[PDB]
Structure formats: C-alpha cells, structure tokens
Amino acid sequence: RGSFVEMVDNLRGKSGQGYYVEMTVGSPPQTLNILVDTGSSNFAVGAAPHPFLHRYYQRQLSSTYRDLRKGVYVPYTQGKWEGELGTDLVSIPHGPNVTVRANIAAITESDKFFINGSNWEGILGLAYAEIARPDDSLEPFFDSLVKQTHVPNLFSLQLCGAGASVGGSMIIGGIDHSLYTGSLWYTPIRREWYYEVIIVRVEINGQDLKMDCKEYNYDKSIVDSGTTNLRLPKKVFEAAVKSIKAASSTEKFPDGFWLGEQLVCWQAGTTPWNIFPVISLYLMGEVTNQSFRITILPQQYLRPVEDVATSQDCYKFAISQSSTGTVMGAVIMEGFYVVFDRARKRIGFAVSACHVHDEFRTAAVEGPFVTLDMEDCGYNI
Ligand SMILES: C[C@]1(c2cc(NC(=O)c3cnc(OCF)cn3)ccc2F)N=C(N)SCC12CCS(=O)(=O)CC2
C-alpha cells in the first residue's frame, strides 16, 4: 500500500485518442494495448484483422481459451461493435503480478468503434456488472480480478494530458501518494452501474449558476475516462456557456466555437488563458450537509488540436451538451488524481501532480463546504 513504482507511467496515448494500458491475453501471452474506460463494463478486444489495428487477439493461438458459445451485439448512435464471448488468462504487465481468468468479448465486426491512427486494439470496461453487455451475468474484468486474487477492491487514475503524446498511471489495487498534492476528497458512488456521482453546485469563475440541484444530474452524472469532454446536460450547458462568454468578454469568438462546430486559434505561445474562467463542480461529500469543490482550468477545457492541416496553436472548446446527463471526462480527470474506491463505494479526487497549469492558477480540490438538500440534486424515474 502507498507506493506502486512498477505501475507508475503505465498509461500511454495520443491527444483525443484516449489512455491505454498494455495487457496480455492467452497462453502464450498476446500483448495488446487496451483503452482504459470507466464508462463501460466489457473487456472487448479486436479479434480480426481490421485494417486500422496494429494487432488483434488470435484465439487459435491460445491454449487457455474457452468458448462461451454466446454472441454479443452492442449498437449505438454512430455505429456498433459485435463479438463472440469467451474466457482466457489475462495479465497487466505493468500491474500486479497476477493472472486472472476473465471474460473476453472477441470483436469480429465494428462500425466507428476503432480509431484510424490510434494505438489501442481494445477496451477495458472498468464500470459495474449492471451495464455489462449482453447482461449483468457477464462478470466485468475488475470483479474477476478482485474475486480471484488478493488485490484490494480499488484502482486509481492519473490521466496526464498534453498542453501529441499523453501519459499517466493506473494503480491497480492501491494509491500512489506521489501522483497528487494536497488531500483526497471523496464523493459517494450513488449507484454501482456507471461510476455515478452527484453534482451539488456549479460555479463559473466563482459565480454560482443558480440552477436547481437536479438539473446538474439530469438524468445522471458519471466519471468517465472513455470520454474526452466535460459533457453537461442541455440546460446546464446553456447557462454555463452564457456565463463563460460573459467572463470572456475581453475577446470575441464565433457562436460555432462554443458548440465545438469550429476551432479557434492564436499565435504560438500567445494564448490568453487569463481571459477564460475557472470551472467549479461541487460534489456530494461523505457527511450529511458537507460538500467539496473541484476546480478546472482553461488548460483542461480548451484542448490543443495539432491535427489541423488548414492552419500552421488552434484549440477546441471541450465542454459540450448531452442528453445522457453529466459526463466528467478527460477534461475533468486530467486535472485530478482520481481514486475509484470500490470497496468503500466512493470516488476520491485530489489535485494531480501532472496537471497542466500556468504561473497564475492551479486546479484545486477544496473543502469542506456546507450544502443542504444534496439528496435532491439526485434524479429518479
Ligand atoms: C464504450 C465507449 C467508447 C469510448 C471510446 N473513447 C475514446 O476513444 C476516447 C478518446 N479520448 C479520450 O480522452 C482524451 F484522450 C477518451 N476516450 C472509444 C470507443 C468506445 F466504444 N465508452 C465510453 N466511456 S463513451 C462511448 C462508448 C460508450 C457509450 S456508446 O456505446 O454509446 C459508444 C461507445
């Protein structure tokens, strides 16, 4: 407990292409890069020679593979992934020294699932059984790991981010104190499906948005390492933007930029960070009527876009509207060291030692604060 040097820096990626960890599957071990995803619950890997993929899982080569004789079909708005369920021996080379028999969805067809140019071939769904596909009988990887080893029921993420290569750490079964400054503050996991949390108050540059409790969590708030943006519910997004525009009145920008429909650029080394507000989410504390506050910088919500071939320091506004509730994606998580305390049904937040900041302002985790009716920020059908 406390120092996990072997796991420090085990996360890699490219800006906007997520964070991945090296894993091995089967015997002999087939190495794959796997996207760390706290927003889903399936261990799903490419199993066929899709042209975008560096490699893929080849079941024929593995003496420990076991077929479950069940397909799985996961559709969504932009496309789909489908696969054949099995189990096999799984390890994380830069994780604990254990091998687990876990479920593997072997991907055999997809549409707009894999990213062209990316270096990952699969997705580690780290959320709970209730949202595993096809159903909650399919035990998620982390449940198998805890059930089969002496690994504590906890993991933490330091997602580092650029300011294009990213990095960070996934501490399996513990916390590394060198990855954060100040103290951890815990928010309760409302229900064990996604990592669900309750946002209790929103401030832009210290100004309360003044909306009802309930809107911030309509229909859900989640902590999601598989989403880039801070995604806010429609009404919350509107009020936030009105406020951000107002705070950034010194320089004007087209209306499309705020909808992430176009980019905006400055001359190199001359970004006016200072003209942009801090954003504060207050989270339900551990104790009745107690809350804490996390604060992100423009360095977190203005993402550097290197990819633009039509221009030779451009940025994307990475706060966006949602119909699925609040999603605290990379925009949030790049500010903090995030502890998913599954054992104690809570998520810790602390200032990330690696978060990108300037000489003037820092990402912050502050408390305690007094907030009443925090249960009422929560949503029910
Ligand atoms: C499985 C999935 C997913 C995420 C990603 N992410 C990235 O690629 C990325 C990129 N950059 C990120 O941060 C910045 F690096 C962070 N995640 C890819 C495939 C997926 F299948 N996981 C998520 N947490 S939400 C989209 C989703 C779930 C909902 S759904 O089924 O409607 C579509 C797919």
Side-chain angles (χ1 to χ4, degrees), residues 15-19 35 37-40 74-77 81 112-113 115 120 123 166 224-229 303 330 334:
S15 166
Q17 295 191 337
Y19 299 78
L35 174 88
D37 182 14
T38 65
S40 72
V74 182
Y76 43 88
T77 269
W81 73 265
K112 296 184 197 77
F113 179 72
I115 299 160
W120 53 266
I123 178 160
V166 297
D224 185 6
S225 64
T227 297
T228 302
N229 288 359
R303 322 277 294 167
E334 287 176 17

PDB file of all heavy atoms in Angstrom, residues 14-19 35 37-40 74-77 81 112-113 115 120 123 166 224-229 303 330 334, ligand 1, unseen atoms left out:
ATOM      1  N   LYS A  14      -2.487   9.228 -27.394  1.00  0.00           N
ATOM      2  CA  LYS A  14      -2.393  10.435 -28.191  1.00  0.00           C
ATOM      3  C   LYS A  14      -3.572  11.309 -27.800  1.00  0.00           C
ATOM      4  O   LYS A  14      -4.650  10.796 -27.448  1.00  0.00           O
ATOM      5  CB  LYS A  14      -2.375  10.119 -29.697  1.00  0.00           C
ATOM      6  N   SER A  15      -3.341  12.623 -27.814  1.00  0.00           N
ATOM      7  CA  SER A  15      -4.382  13.617 -27.553  1.00  0.00           C
ATOM      8  C   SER A  15      -5.659  13.298 -28.335  1.00  0.00           C
ATOM      9  O   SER A  15      -5.632  13.126 -29.568  1.00  0.00           O
ATOM     10  CB  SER A  15      -3.882  15.032 -27.888  1.00  0.00           C
ATOM     11  OG  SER A  15      -4.973  15.947 -27.934  1.00  0.00           O
ATOM     12  N   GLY A  16      -6.761  13.186 -27.603  1.00  0.00           N
ATOM     13  CA  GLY A  16      -8.061  12.874 -28.199  1.00  0.00           C
ATOM     14  C   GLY A  16      -8.250  11.429 -28.619  1.00  0.00           C
ATOM     15  O   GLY A  16      -9.275  11.100 -29.201  1.00  0.00           O
ATOM     16  N   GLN A  17      -7.287  10.559 -28.311  1.00  0.00           N
ATOM     17  CA  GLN A  17      -7.390   9.140 -28.665  1.00  0.00           C
ATOM     18  C   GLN A  17      -7.418   8.230 -27.442  1.00  0.00           C
ATOM     19  O   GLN A  17      -7.269   7.002 -27.562  1.00  0.00           O
ATOM     20  CB  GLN A  17      -6.255   8.744 -29.606  1.00  0.00           C
ATOM     21  CG  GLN A  17      -6.314   9.425 -30.962  1.00  0.00           C
ATOM     22  CD  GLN A  17      -5.351   8.831 -31.973  1.00  0.00           C
ATOM     23  OE1 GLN A  17      -4.347   8.211 -31.615  1.00  0.00           O
ATOM     24  NE2 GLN A  17      -5.656   9.024 -33.256  1.00  0.00           N
ATOM     25  N   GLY A  18      -7.587   8.840 -26.265  1.00  0.00           N
ATOM     26  CA  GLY A  18      -7.763   8.111 -25.003  1.00  0.00           C
ATOM     27  C   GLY A  18      -6.493   7.562 -24.404  1.00  0.00           C
ATOM     28  O   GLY A  18      -5.415   7.691 -24.981  1.00  0.00           O
ATOM     29  N   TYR A  19      -6.632   6.927 -23.244  1.00  0.00           N
ATOM     30  CA  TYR A  19      -5.489   6.410 -22.498  1.00  0.00           C
ATOM     31  C   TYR A  19      -5.589   4.918 -22.509  1.00  0.00           C
ATOM     32  O   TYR A  19      -6.669   4.370 -22.272  1.00  0.00           O
ATOM     33  CB  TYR A  19      -5.493   6.936 -21.055  1.00  0.00           C
ATOM     34  CG  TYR A  19      -5.396   8.445 -20.975  1.00  0.00           C
ATOM     35  CD1 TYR A  19      -6.508   9.246 -21.213  1.00  0.00           C
ATOM     36  CD2 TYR A  19      -4.171   9.070 -20.685  1.00  0.00           C
ATOM     37  CE1 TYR A  19      -6.413  10.623 -21.168  1.00  0.00           C
ATOM     38  CE2 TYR A  19      -4.063  10.456 -20.619  1.00  0.00           C
ATOM     39  CZ  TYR A  19      -5.182  11.231 -20.870  1.00  0.00           C
ATOM     40  OH  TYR A  19      -5.086  12.606 -20.812  1.00  0.00           O
ATOM     41  N   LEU A  35      -7.688   0.372 -24.137  1.00  0.00           N
ATOM     42  CA  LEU A  35      -8.209   1.654 -23.657  1.00  0.00           C
ATOM     43  C   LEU A  35      -8.876   1.531 -22.283  1.00  0.00           C
ATOM     44  O   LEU A  35      -9.742   0.676 -22.064  1.00  0.00           O
ATOM     45  CB  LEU A  35      -9.186   2.258 -24.672  1.00  0.00           C
ATOM     46  CG  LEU A  35      -9.907   3.530 -24.215  1.00  0.00           C
ATOM     47  CD1 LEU A  35      -9.092   4.774 -24.550  1.00  0.00           C
ATOM     48  CD2 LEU A  35     -11.279   3.628 -24.853  1.00  0.00           C
ATOM     49  N   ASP A  37     -11.334   2.461 -19.660  1.00  0.00           N
ATOM     50  CA  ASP A  37     -12.659   3.025 -19.821  1.00  0.00           C
ATOM     51  C   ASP A  37     -13.541   2.835 -18.592  1.00  0.00           C
ATOM     52  O   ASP A  37     -14.108   1.753 -18.407  1.00  0.00           O
ATOM     53  CB  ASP A  37     -13.320   2.450 -21.083  1.00  0.00           C
ATOM     54  CG  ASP A  37     -14.694   3.030 -21.343  1.00  0.00           C
ATOM     55  OD1 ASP A  37     -15.057   4.064 -20.733  1.00  0.00           O
ATOM     56  OD2 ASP A  37     -15.428   2.463 -22.185  1.00  0.00           O
ATOM     57  N   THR A  38     -13.682   3.892 -17.782  1.00  0.00           N
ATOM     58  CA  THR A  38     -14.536   3.807 -16.583  1.00  0.00           C
ATOM     59  C   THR A  38     -16.009   4.043 -16.886  1.00  0.00           C
ATOM     60  O   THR A  38     -16.827   4.065 -15.966  1.00  0.00           O
ATOM     61  CB  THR A  38     -14.086   4.708 -15.397  1.00  0.00           C
ATOM     62  OG1 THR A  38     -14.182   6.087 -15.757  1.00  0.00           O
ATOM     63  CG2 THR A  38     -12.658   4.372 -14.946  1.00  0.00           C
ATOM     64  N   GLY A  39     -16.338   4.206 -18.169  1.00  0.00           N
ATOM     65  CA  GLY A  39     -17.720   4.410 -18.611  1.00  0.00           C
ATOM     66  C   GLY A  39     -18.442   3.210 -19.197  1.00  0.00           C
ATOM     67  O   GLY A  39     -19.549   3.359 -19.720  1.00  0.00           O
ATOM     68  N   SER A  40     -17.826   2.029 -19.120  1.00  0.00           N
ATOM     69  CA  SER A  40     -18.398   0.790 -19.643  1.00  0.00           C
ATOM     70  C   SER A  40     -17.882  -0.412 -18.847  1.00  0.00           C
ATOM     71  O   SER A  40     -16.998  -0.268 -18.010  1.00  0.00           O
ATOM     72  CB  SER A  40     -18.084   0.634 -21.142  1.00  0.00           C
ATOM     73  OG  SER A  40     -16.709   0.326 -21.372  1.00  0.00           O
ATOM     74  N   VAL A  74     -23.502  -4.917 -29.517  1.00  0.00           N
ATOM     75  CA  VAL A  74     -23.527  -3.614 -28.859  1.00  0.00           C
ATOM     76  C   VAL A  74     -23.676  -2.509 -29.921  1.00  0.00           C
ATOM     77  O   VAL A  74     -22.692  -2.115 -30.551  1.00  0.00           O
ATOM     78  CB  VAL A  74     -22.299  -3.405 -27.929  1.00  0.00           C
ATOM     79  CG1 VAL A  74     -22.365  -2.066 -27.205  1.00  0.00           C
ATOM     80  CG2 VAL A  74     -22.221  -4.530 -26.907  1.00  0.00           C
ATOM     81  N   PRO A  75     -24.926  -2.044 -30.147  1.00  0.00           N
ATOM     82  CA  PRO A  75     -25.173  -0.921 -31.034  1.00  0.00           C
ATOM     83  C   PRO A  75     -25.256   0.410 -30.298  1.00  0.00           C
ATOM     84  O   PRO A  75     -25.630   0.463 -29.132  1.00  0.00           O
ATOM     85  CB  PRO A  75     -26.528  -1.271 -31.660  1.00  0.00           C
ATOM     86  CG  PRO A  75     -27.224  -2.095 -30.629  1.00  0.00           C
ATOM     87  CD  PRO A  75     -26.187  -2.702 -29.736  1.00  0.00           C
ATOM     88  N   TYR A  76     -24.905   1.474 -31.004  1.00  0.00           N
ATOM     89  CA  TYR A  76     -25.072   2.838 -30.519  1.00  0.00           C
ATOM     90  C   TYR A  76     -25.391   3.752 -31.700  1.00  0.00           C
ATOM     91  O   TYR A  76     -25.520   3.275 -32.831  1.00  0.00           O
ATOM     92  CB  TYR A  76     -23.834   3.313 -29.737  1.00  0.00           C
ATOM     93  CG  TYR A  76     -22.502   2.952 -30.358  1.00  0.00           C
ATOM     94  CD1 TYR A  76     -21.905   3.799 -31.292  1.00  0.00           C
ATOM     95  CD2 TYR A  76     -21.835   1.762 -30.007  1.00  0.00           C
ATOM     96  CE1 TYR A  76     -20.684   3.476 -31.870  1.00  0.00           C
ATOM     97  CE2 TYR A  76     -20.616   1.431 -30.579  1.00  0.00           C
ATOM     98  CZ  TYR A  76     -20.049   2.290 -31.509  1.00  0.00           C
ATOM     99  OH  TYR A  76     -18.849   1.990 -32.094  1.00  0.00           O
ATOM    100  N   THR A  77     -25.520   5.053 -31.430  1.00  0.00           N
ATOM    101  CA  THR A  77     -25.933   6.054 -32.430  1.00  0.00           C
ATOM    102  C   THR A  77     -25.004   6.108 -33.675  1.00  0.00           C
ATOM    103  O   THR A  77     -25.473   5.938 -34.797  1.00  0.00           O
ATOM    104  CB  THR A  77     -26.245   7.424 -31.743  1.00  0.00           C
ATOM    105  OG1 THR A  77     -27.639   7.462 -31.399  1.00  0.00           O
ATOM    106  CG2 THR A  77     -25.915   8.639 -32.615  1.00  0.00           C
ATOM    107  N   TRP A  81     -20.274  -2.382 -32.192  1.00  0.00           N
ATOM    108  CA  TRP A  81     -19.324  -3.495 -32.121  1.00  0.00           C
ATOM    109  C   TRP A  81     -20.061  -4.770 -31.760  1.00  0.00           C
ATOM    110  O   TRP A  81     -21.029  -4.743 -31.000  1.00  0.00           O
ATOM    111  CB  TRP A  81     -18.166  -3.225 -31.147  1.00  0.00           C
ATOM    112  CG  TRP A  81     -18.475  -3.270 -29.645  1.00  0.00           C
ATOM    113  CD1 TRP A  81     -18.781  -2.202 -28.834  1.00  0.00           C
ATOM    114  CD2 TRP A  81     -18.459  -4.430 -28.788  1.00  0.00           C
ATOM    115  NE1 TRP A  81     -18.959  -2.630 -27.527  1.00  0.00           N
ATOM    116  CE2 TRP A  81     -18.766  -3.987 -27.471  1.00  0.00           C
ATOM    117  CE3 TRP A  81     -18.218  -5.802 -29.003  1.00  0.00           C
ATOM    118  CZ2 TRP A  81     -18.842  -4.874 -26.371  1.00  0.00           C
ATOM    119  CZ3 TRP A  81     -18.295  -6.681 -27.919  1.00  0.00           C
ATOM    120  CH2 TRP A  81     -18.615  -6.212 -26.615  1.00  0.00           C
ATOM    121  N   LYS A 112     -17.301   2.366 -36.715  1.00  0.00           N
ATOM    122  CA  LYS A 112     -16.891   3.590 -35.991  1.00  0.00           C
ATOM    123  C   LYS A 112     -16.576   3.344 -34.504  1.00  0.00           C
ATOM    124  O   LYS A 112     -16.879   4.162 -33.633  1.00  0.00           O
ATOM    125  CB  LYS A 112     -17.904   4.743 -36.187  1.00  0.00           C
ATOM    126  CG  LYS A 112     -18.037   5.253 -37.617  1.00  0.00           C
ATOM    127  CD  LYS A 112     -18.993   6.442 -37.671  1.00  0.00           C
ATOM    128  CE  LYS A 112     -19.489   6.733 -39.082  1.00  0.00           C
ATOM    129  NZ  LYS A 112     -20.540   5.766 -39.520  1.00  0.00           N
ATOM    130  N   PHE A 113     -15.960   2.195 -34.244  1.00  0.00           N
ATOM    131  CA  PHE A 113     -15.543   1.799 -32.919  1.00  0.00           C
ATOM    132  C   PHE A 113     -14.067   2.100 -32.709  1.00  0.00           C
ATOM    133  O   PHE A 113     -13.711   2.843 -31.793  1.00  0.00           O
ATOM    134  CB  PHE A 113     -15.814   0.317 -32.742  1.00  0.00           C
ATOM    135  CG  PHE A 113     -15.402  -0.226 -31.407  1.00  0.00           C
ATOM    136  CD1 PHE A 113     -16.129   0.096 -30.238  1.00  0.00           C
ATOM    137  CD2 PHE A 113     -14.300  -1.081 -31.306  1.00  0.00           C
ATOM    138  CE1 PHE A 113     -15.755  -0.416 -28.990  1.00  0.00           C
ATOM    139  CE2 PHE A 113     -13.932  -1.596 -30.067  1.00  0.00           C
ATOM    140  CZ  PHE A 113     -14.660  -1.267 -28.910  1.00  0.00           C
ATOM    141  N   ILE A 115     -10.378   3.727 -33.719  1.00  0.00           N
ATOM    142  CA  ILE A 115      -9.914   4.988 -34.291  1.00  0.00           C
ATOM    143  C   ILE A 115      -8.775   4.722 -35.275  1.00  0.00           C
ATOM    144  O   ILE A 115      -7.776   4.067 -34.932  1.00  0.00           O
ATOM    145  CB  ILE A 115      -9.453   5.992 -33.192  1.00  0.00           C
ATOM    146  CG1 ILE A 115     -10.612   6.336 -32.231  1.00  0.00           C
ATOM    147  CG2 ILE A 115      -8.827   7.253 -33.809  1.00  0.00           C
ATOM    148  CD1 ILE A 115     -10.183   6.890 -30.885  1.00  0.00           C
ATOM    149  N   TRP A 120      -4.485   1.603 -29.829  1.00  0.00           N
ATOM    150  CA  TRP A 120      -5.144   0.614 -28.992  1.00  0.00           C
ATOM    151  C   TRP A 120      -6.052  -0.271 -29.815  1.00  0.00           C
ATOM    152  O   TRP A 120      -6.542   0.152 -30.852  1.00  0.00           O
ATOM    153  CB  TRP A 120      -5.864   1.249 -27.788  1.00  0.00           C
ATOM    154  CG  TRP A 120      -6.821   2.342 -28.131  1.00  0.00           C
ATOM    155  CD1 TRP A 120      -6.566   3.679 -28.147  1.00  0.00           C
ATOM    156  CD2 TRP A 120      -8.197   2.190 -28.513  1.00  0.00           C
ATOM    157  NE1 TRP A 120      -7.694   4.377 -28.503  1.00  0.00           N
ATOM    158  CE2 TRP A 120      -8.712   3.490 -28.735  1.00  0.00           C
ATOM    159  CE3 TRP A 120      -9.045   1.077 -28.692  1.00  0.00           C
ATOM    160  CZ2 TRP A 120     -10.043   3.717 -29.118  1.00  0.00           C
ATOM    161  CZ3 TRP A 120     -10.375   1.302 -29.072  1.00  0.00           C
ATOM    162  CH2 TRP A 120     -10.859   2.616 -29.281  1.00  0.00           C
ATOM    163  N   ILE A 123     -10.786  -2.390 -25.339  1.00  0.00           N
ATOM    164  CA  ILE A 123     -11.349  -1.521 -24.337  1.00  0.00           C
ATOM    165  C   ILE A 123     -11.567  -2.301 -23.049  1.00  0.00           C
ATOM    166  O   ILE A 123     -12.140  -3.400 -23.065  1.00  0.00           O
ATOM    167  CB  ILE A 123     -12.610  -0.805 -24.879  1.00  0.00           C
ATOM    168  CG1 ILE A 123     -13.238   0.079 -23.825  1.00  0.00           C
ATOM    169  CG2 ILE A 123     -13.655  -1.782 -25.387  1.00  0.00           C
ATOM    170  CD1 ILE A 123     -14.130   1.130 -24.436  1.00  0.00           C
ATOM    171  N   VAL A 166       0.219  11.656 -24.628  1.00  0.00           N
ATOM    172  CA  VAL A 166      -0.239  11.790 -23.261  1.00  0.00           C
ATOM    173  C   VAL A 166       0.360  10.647 -22.457  1.00  0.00           C
ATOM    174  O   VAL A 166       1.055   9.790 -23.003  1.00  0.00           O
ATOM    175  CB  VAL A 166      -1.792  11.846 -23.144  1.00  0.00           C
ATOM    176  CG1 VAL A 166      -2.358  13.072 -23.852  1.00  0.00           C
ATOM    177  CG2 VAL A 166      -2.467  10.584 -23.672  1.00  0.00           C
ATOM    178  N   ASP A 224     -16.013   9.384 -16.211  1.00  0.00           N
ATOM    179  CA  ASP A 224     -15.761   8.562 -17.395  1.00  0.00           C
ATOM    180  C   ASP A 224     -14.440   8.842 -18.097  1.00  0.00           C
ATOM    181  O   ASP A 224     -14.292   9.861 -18.763  1.00  0.00           O
ATOM    182  CB  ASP A 224     -16.929   8.706 -18.375  1.00  0.00           C
ATOM    183  CG  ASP A 224     -16.804   7.812 -19.571  1.00  0.00           C
ATOM    184  OD1 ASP A 224     -15.885   6.969 -19.644  1.00  0.00           O
ATOM    185  OD2 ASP A 224     -17.660   7.924 -20.459  1.00  0.00           O
ATOM    186  N   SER A 225     -13.506   7.900 -17.974  1.00  0.00           N
ATOM    187  CA  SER A 225     -12.187   8.014 -18.615  1.00  0.00           C
ATOM    188  C   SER A 225     -12.217   7.750 -20.126  1.00  0.00           C
ATOM    189  O   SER A 225     -11.217   7.962 -20.799  1.00  0.00           O
ATOM    190  CB  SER A 225     -11.197   7.059 -17.950  1.00  0.00           C
ATOM    191  OG  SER A 225     -11.613   5.720 -18.167  1.00  0.00           O
ATOM    192  N   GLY A 226     -13.355   7.271 -20.634  1.00  0.00           N
ATOM    193  CA  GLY A 226     -13.548   6.985 -22.059  1.00  0.00           C
ATOM    194  C   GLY A 226     -14.279   8.072 -22.826  1.00  0.00           C
ATOM    195  O   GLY A 226     -14.741   7.842 -23.945  1.00  0.00           O
ATOM    196  N   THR A 227     -14.388   9.254 -22.224  1.00  0.00           N
ATOM    197  CA  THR A 227     -14.957  10.436 -22.852  1.00  0.00           C
ATOM    198  C   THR A 227     -13.927  11.557 -22.733  1.00  0.00           C
ATOM    199  O   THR A 227     -13.292  11.738 -21.672  1.00  0.00           O
ATOM    200  CB  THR A 227     -16.273  10.855 -22.170  1.00  0.00           C
ATOM    201  OG1 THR A 227     -17.242   9.819 -22.317  1.00  0.00           O
ATOM    202  CG2 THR A 227     -16.845  12.132 -22.787  1.00  0.00           C
ATOM    203  N   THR A 228     -13.756  12.303 -23.821  1.00  0.00           N
ATOM    204  CA  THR A 228     -12.848  13.437 -23.827  1.00  0.00           C
ATOM    205  C   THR A 228     -13.425  14.609 -23.031  1.00  0.00           C
ATOM    206  O   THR A 228     -12.795  15.100 -22.090  1.00  0.00           O
ATOM    207  CB  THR A 228     -12.534  13.880 -25.270  1.00  0.00           C
ATOM    208  OG1 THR A 228     -11.957  12.782 -25.994  1.00  0.00           O
ATOM    209  CG2 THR A 228     -11.588  15.096 -25.287  1.00  0.00           C
ATOM    210  N   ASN A 229     -14.622  15.037 -23.426  1.00  0.00           N
ATOM    211  CA  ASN A 229     -15.204  16.288 -22.957  1.00  0.00           C
ATOM    212  C   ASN A 229     -15.749  16.246 -21.553  1.00  0.00           C
ATOM    213  O   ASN A 229     -16.022  15.165 -21.021  1.00  0.00           O
ATOM    214  CB  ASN A 229     -16.342  16.689 -23.891  1.00  0.00           C
ATOM    215  CG  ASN A 229     -15.852  17.164 -25.246  1.00  0.00           C
ATOM    216  OD1 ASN A 229     -14.645  17.228 -25.514  1.00  0.00           O
ATOM    217  ND2 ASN A 229     -16.790  17.507 -26.108  1.00  0.00           N
ATOM    218  N   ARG A 303      -8.860  22.214 -25.542  1.00  0.00           N
ATOM    219  CA  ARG A 303      -7.959  21.119 -25.957  1.00  0.00           C
ATOM    220  C   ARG A 303      -7.102  21.570 -27.128  1.00  0.00           C
ATOM    221  O   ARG A 303      -7.651  22.080 -28.108  1.00  0.00           O
ATOM    222  CB  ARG A 303      -8.720  19.855 -26.391  1.00  0.00           C
ATOM    223  CG  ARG A 303      -9.971  19.496 -25.617  1.00  0.00           C
ATOM    224  CD  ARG A 303      -9.696  18.734 -24.343  1.00  0.00           C
ATOM    225  NE  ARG A 303      -9.134  17.413 -24.600  1.00  0.00           N
ATOM    226  CZ  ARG A 303      -8.581  16.652 -23.663  1.00  0.00           C
ATOM    227  NH1 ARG A 303      -8.522  17.071 -22.394  1.00  0.00           N
ATOM    228  NH2 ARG A 303      -8.080  15.473 -23.993  1.00  0.00           N
ATOM    229  N   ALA A 330     -12.203  13.243 -19.658  1.00  0.00           N
ATOM    230  CA  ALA A 330     -10.786  13.635 -19.572  1.00  0.00           C
ATOM    231  C   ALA A 330     -10.589  15.096 -19.148  1.00  0.00           C
ATOM    232  O   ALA A 330      -9.682  15.392 -18.370  1.00  0.00           O
ATOM    233  CB  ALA A 330     -10.075  13.356 -20.888  1.00  0.00           C
ATOM    234  N   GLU A 334      -8.125  14.951 -16.195  1.00  0.00           N
ATOM    235  CA  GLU A 334      -6.770  15.461 -16.427  1.00  0.00           C
ATOM    236  C   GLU A 334      -6.317  16.489 -15.374  1.00  0.00           C
ATOM    237  O   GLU A 334      -5.117  16.708 -15.197  1.00  0.00           O
ATOM    238  CB  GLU A 334      -6.627  16.012 -17.845  1.00  0.00           C
ATOM    239  CG  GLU A 334      -6.571  14.924 -18.910  1.00  0.00           C
ATOM    240  CD  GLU A 334      -6.515  15.441 -20.342  1.00  0.00           C
ATOM    241  OE1 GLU A 334      -6.190  16.639 -20.545  1.00  0.00           O
ATOM    242  OE2 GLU A 334      -6.797  14.633 -21.272  1.00  0.00           O
TER     243      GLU A 334
HETATM  244  C1  LIG B   1     -17.527   2.165 -24.907  1.00  0.00           C
HETATM  245  C2  LIG B   1     -17.336   3.673 -25.122  1.00  0.00           C
HETATM  246  C3  LIG B   1     -16.167   4.001 -26.091  1.00  0.00           C
HETATM  247  C4  LIG B   1     -15.316   5.088 -25.825  1.00  0.00           C
HETATM  248  C5  LIG B   1     -14.257   5.436 -26.660  1.00  0.00           C
HETATM  249  N1  LIG B   1     -13.451   6.576 -26.197  1.00  0.00           N
HETATM  250  C6  LIG B   1     -12.306   7.204 -26.869  1.00  0.00           C
HETATM  251  O1  LIG B   1     -11.873   6.880 -27.915  1.00  0.00           O
HETATM  252  C7  LIG B   1     -11.636   8.350 -26.075  1.00  0.00           C
HETATM  253  C8  LIG B   1     -10.798   9.283 -26.685  1.00  0.00           C
HETATM  254  N2  LIG B   1     -10.242  10.229 -25.925  1.00  0.00           N
HETATM  255  C9  LIG B   1     -10.468  10.299 -24.610  1.00  0.00           C
HETATM  256  O2  LIG B   1      -9.897  11.288 -23.776  1.00  0.00           O
HETATM  257  C10 LIG B   1      -8.890  12.079 -24.387  1.00  0.00           C
HETATM  258  F1  LIG B   1      -7.786  11.324 -24.697  1.00  0.00           F
HETATM  259  C11 LIG B   1     -11.297   9.370 -24.018  1.00  0.00           C
HETATM  260  N3  LIG B   1     -11.840   8.404 -24.761  1.00  0.00           N
HETATM  261  C12 LIG B   1     -13.986   4.672 -27.780  1.00  0.00           C
HETATM  262  C13 LIG B   1     -14.819   3.580 -28.068  1.00  0.00           C
HETATM  263  C14 LIG B   1     -15.889   3.243 -27.240  1.00  0.00           C
HETATM  264  F2  LIG B   1     -16.641   2.178 -27.593  1.00  0.00           F
HETATM  265  N4  LIG B   1     -17.037   4.146 -23.760  1.00  0.00           N
HETATM  266  C15 LIG B   1     -17.332   5.248 -23.251  1.00  0.00           C
HETATM  267  N5  LIG B   1     -16.979   5.513 -21.881  1.00  0.00           N
HETATM  268  S1  LIG B   1     -18.202   6.545 -24.129  1.00  0.00           S
HETATM  269  C16 LIG B   1     -18.706   5.782 -25.684  1.00  0.00           C
HETATM  270  C17 LIG B   1     -18.726   4.209 -25.571  1.00  0.00           C
HETATM  271  C18 LIG B   1     -19.984   4.008 -24.613  1.00  0.00           C
HETATM  272  C19 LIG B   1     -21.376   4.572 -24.937  1.00  0.00           C
HETATM  273  S2  LIG B   1     -21.710   4.042 -26.592  1.00  0.00           S
HETATM  274  O3  LIG B   1     -21.835   2.578 -26.569  1.00  0.00           O
HETATM  275  O4  LIG B   1     -22.929   4.768 -26.967  1.00  0.00           O
HETATM  276  C20 LIG B   1     -20.387   4.432 -27.715  1.00  0.00           C
HETATM  277  C21 LIG B   1     -19.063   3.952 -27.104  1.00  0.00           C
END
